[PDB]
């Protein structure tokens, strides 16, 4: 299970709008900036002048899976990331590229934290592991040379989903899925108090200026201040009624603004009858955003699993929202036609697309047909399996592996593939071939060819390197070929790619022992072979033969351009008769 | 009476416990009436009401097989009741099945992902049911809740995606011989006679399988059954009384296997 797997992504070059829901929210009220950080392992830049048409500015396109949480630093000279594919990355906000990426977690990393006096922060995930990062080194930080000072923070009995410090940096708890809060001191790593009184998941955490008091909200749908300086829960809240997964807070320390499940935002005093309805949105809330551009807290940004992010301002306080980010359809059925080459896609939306897998591409768009009744508008064929897909961010994500990837063999004629004759070829094969095709080393000449040499993938499509969860590696089919890029290849695509992409070490037939009897005969073949190939041998036993020989399996007579593994796949050791 | 091979009792103790289910006993005599491990347990159990007996017959069958019994050592009577089991459900299901119809219940297997605390819920069948150590609360009610978290997340609906659950099962339909089955990886495990399950059908203790030893695969198996009570080890066929049961709930003994046939 640390064996190495290679994913790539089916996506336009440019994915302007999210095309899953949004985890994280983060706001530059110095250049007017929201980032979003998406369920969908891309985080998008925008306006939020009243100004802008589309407010896009950019994309910042390095993770593999949910981007969970974003942190702001150096005023927004500086980004930091964290996602289910392992990784806490490290970002230049202004200009919009990755500078770096550290993958001590072992998995998915769900949330960080910011001190902004001391500038150190945390990440915290899946893994039960806390650690600890002082930013200045992390911006010097790149790809080619990520070894730094990493102080680790250890208590934690389960899964970690919150994480949170002071203002100060003095003060970080966490909370997780037992219902206690583990507490620290960062600049010392030494355990502080736990924090029994839940009896649900934490999903979120704040403190104040000083880290004396703190809130935390939970899956039992209860927000509890807590005296630090008291180790002790001061007041429980039941404004909600489903579990609690996202709060903010103002200046004073005073006022809360919470949303959950409910999808209600309410907003209540700890002077905490006085709740203030603002709205329900359409989706369960993920996380929120308050604007600081002045005090009374203006207007409230809302992230939900909604593709779509609006903001909200301040029975319903409001009703329409003020603001509205749009967001992409996400697939959310798939269907692969097993010619094991295709794919009938459906997203939000209802629009049904067919795709090719081997190249990397959308056939078409089919408006809304009744999907389950476009699958059938359905070759009879079977060819082996080879790959694997997931929608996890809302994209056709497609997975090789190499217990598999070198099964599917099928006919240069029978795969669309010009023949002025007819080769046997290996699907995944050549699509290794496509995705390094722009990898120096997958140029070798055997007895100077670069690529496979029927098709490409498309120069924008990325490439990913994946343990069976860690993500090892990541870049776009064309950037094969930048040194710093290449360097890191030799350090990470493995032997089974290498074999076939550099080596042009070509893989194992299958073969089908098989039975002919009208005394039956045993013979054998390539299970691609083609029936016509078999009343051939019977003749002798070439036109002619067409006229001459029926083929028979289970007294079902066969169609002459069938190859041996579907009449064993559907009709059907493998035997036919003869007549 | 079923002579003993060397450690081949893990067989002659689930043989002579299916022996007692009467619906499955039926079905199963039929069955010769009209070359693989079912007309091996047929040929065997066509000779058992006939007239102490070595199934050779069968354990020839078995071994050659299933390759996980074919060693000197011990086996777990489990593995091959569900082995000995499916085995029948589907050797049927080529040529919905008698024994679907006898040992088949359903249970109910909730599962709430953490990130959207979806409560999804599907159901999946069983012929037999595995549970760990009171069994009136076992069944009537649920499991607790077992965590889904490094290599074994859960996918989600909602999620689209593998995130981190909770599991626990629930019965959702009862069969009519419940084949059931109590944990190892040793204590005071306490079961009745007659059993009030979910229209309350209440069951007779029918057939049931014991354990001596601290350790599943290196003890001893035997059999306690349903006459017209007695008690089956290997060579020795001896009667037995009700309250002899008791004695079974360091190497403080407990059993194994029950079997609960329907008041019906």
């Known amino acids: 299970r640390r064996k190495v797997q290679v994913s790539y992504v089916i996506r336009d070059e440019v994915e302007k709008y999210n095309r899953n829901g949004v985890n994280a929210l983060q706001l530059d009220p110095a250049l007017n900036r929201l980032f979003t950080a998406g369920r969908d392992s891309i985080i998008r830049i925008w306006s939020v002048n009243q100004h802008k048409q589309d407010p896009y500015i950019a994309s910042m396109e390095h993770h593999t899976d949910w981007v ?6 150096c005023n927004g000279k500086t980004l930091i990331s964290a996602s289910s594919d392992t990784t806490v990355k490290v970002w230049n906000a ?59 923070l250890s208590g934690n009995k389960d899964s970690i989903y919150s994480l949170a410090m002071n203002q100060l940096g003095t003060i970080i708890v966490s909370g997780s899925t037992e219902k206690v809060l583990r507490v620290w001191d960062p600049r010392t790593c030494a355990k502080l108090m736990k924090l029994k009184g839940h009896t649900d998941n934490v999903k979120a955490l704040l403190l104040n200026r000083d880290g004396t008091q703190c809130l935390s909200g939970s899956s039992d749908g209860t927000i509890r201040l807590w005296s630090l300086g008291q180790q002790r829960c001061i007041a429980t809240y039941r404004v909600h009624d489903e579990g609690v997964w996202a709060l903010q807070v103002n200046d004073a320390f005073t006022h809360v603004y919470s949303g959950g499940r409910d999808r ?26 308050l604007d600081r551009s002045a005090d009374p807290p203006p207007a409230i940004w809302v992230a939900t699993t909604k593709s779509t992010v609006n903001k909200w301002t301040l029975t319903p306080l409001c009703t329409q929202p003020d603001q509205v980010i749009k967001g992409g359809a996400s697939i959310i059925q798939c269907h692969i036609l097993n010619d094991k080459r295709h794919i009938l896609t459906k997203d939000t939306n209802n629009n049904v697309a067919y795709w090719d897998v081997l190249k990397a591409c959308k056939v078409e768009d089919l408006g809304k047909v009744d999907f389950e009744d476009e699958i059938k508008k359905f070759k009879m064929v079977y060819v082996p399996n080879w790959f694997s897909v997931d929608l996890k961010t809302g994209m056709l994500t497609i997975t090789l592996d190499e217990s598999d990837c070198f099964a599917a063999w099928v006919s240069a004629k029978d795969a669309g ?4 004759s007819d080769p046997k070829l290996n699907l995944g094969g050549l699509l290794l071939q496509a995705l390094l095709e722009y990898w120096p080393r997958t140029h070798v000449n055997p007895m100077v060819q670069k690529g496979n040499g029927y098709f490409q ?8 390197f994946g343990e069976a969860g860690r993500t090892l590696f990541r870049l776009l089919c064309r950037d094969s070929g930048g040194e710093t890029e290449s360097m890191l290849l030799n350090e990470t695509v493995p032997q089974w790619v290498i074999d076939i992409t550099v080596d042009k070490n070509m893989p194992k037939f299958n073969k089908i022992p098989f039975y002919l009897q009208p005394k039956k005969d045993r013979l054998s073949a390539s299970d691609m072979l083609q029936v016509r190939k078999v009343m ?3 003749y002798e036993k070439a036109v002619l033969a067409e006229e001459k020989i029926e083929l028979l399996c289970q007294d079902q007579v066969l169609d002459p351009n069938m190859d041996l593994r579907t009449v064993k796949h559907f009709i059907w050791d493998l035997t036919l008769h003869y007549r | 009476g079923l002579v003993n091979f060397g450690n081949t009792c893990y067989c002659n103790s689930v043989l002579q416990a299916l022996y007692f289910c009467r619906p499955f006993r039926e079905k199963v005599l039929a069955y010769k009436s009209q070359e693989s491990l079912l007309t091996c347990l047929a040929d065997l159990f066509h000779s058992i009401a006939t007239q102490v007996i070595p199934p050779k017959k069968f354990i020839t069958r078995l071994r050659k097989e299933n390759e996980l019994f074919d060693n000197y050592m011990q086996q777990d009577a489990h593995e091959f009741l569900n082995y000995l089991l499916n085995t029948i459900a589907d050797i049927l299901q080529e040529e919905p099945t008698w024994v679907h119809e006898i040992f088949q219940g359903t249970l109910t297997n909730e599962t709430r992902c953490l990130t959207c605390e979806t409560i999804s819920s599907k159901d999946e069948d069983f012929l037999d049911l595995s549970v760990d150590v009171s069994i009136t609360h076992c069944l009537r009610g649920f499991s607790n809740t077992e ?54 059908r209440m069951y007779d203790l029918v057939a049931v399988v014991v354990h001596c030893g601290s350790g599943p695969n290196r003890g001893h198996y035997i059999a306690i059954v349903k006459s017209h009570w007695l ?14 049961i008791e004695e079974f709930y360091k190497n403080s003994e407990s059993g194994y296997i029950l079997f609960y046939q329907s008041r019906d």
């Not at chain 1, 945390?122 to 040379?145: C, E, H, K, P, Y």
């Not at chain 1, 700890?270 to 309805?277: E, N, T, Y």
């Not at chain 2, 204590?187 to 009745?192: A, D, G, H, L, S």
């Not at chain 2, 008690?231 to 002899?244: P, Y």
């Open chain 2, 231 to 244: 008690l089956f080890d290997d060579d020795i066929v001896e009667k037995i009384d009700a309250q002899a």
């Open chain 1, 536 to 538: 051939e041998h019977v």
């Open chain 1, 264 to 289: 209600k935002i309410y907003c209540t005093d700890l002077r905490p009858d006085i709740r203030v309805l603002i709205c329900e949105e359409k989706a369960p809330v993920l996380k929120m955003e």
């Open chain 1, 457 to 464: 993938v498309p120069p924008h499509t990325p490439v990913i």
């Open chain 2, 147 to 200: 965590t889904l978290c490094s290599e074994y997340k859960y996918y989600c609906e909602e999620c689209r995606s593998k995130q981190e659950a909770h599991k626990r099962m629930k019965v959702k339909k009862l069969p009519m011989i419940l084949a059931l089955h109590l944990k190892r990886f040793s204590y005071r495990v306490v079961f009745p006679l007659e059993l009030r399950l979910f229209p309350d």
């Open chain 1, 417 to 420: 593939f010009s023949s002025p």
């Open chain 1, 68 to 73: 969970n949480d974003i942190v702001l630093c």
């Open chain 1, 94 to 152: 202004h200009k919009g590229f990755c500078m770096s990426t550290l993958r001590t977690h072992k998995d998915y990393v769900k949330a960080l934290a910011y001190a902004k006096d001391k500038e150190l922060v945390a990440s915290a995930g899946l893994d039960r592991q806390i650690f600890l990062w002082d930013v200045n080194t992390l911006t010097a930080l790149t790809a080619s040379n990520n070894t730094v000072t990493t102080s680790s």
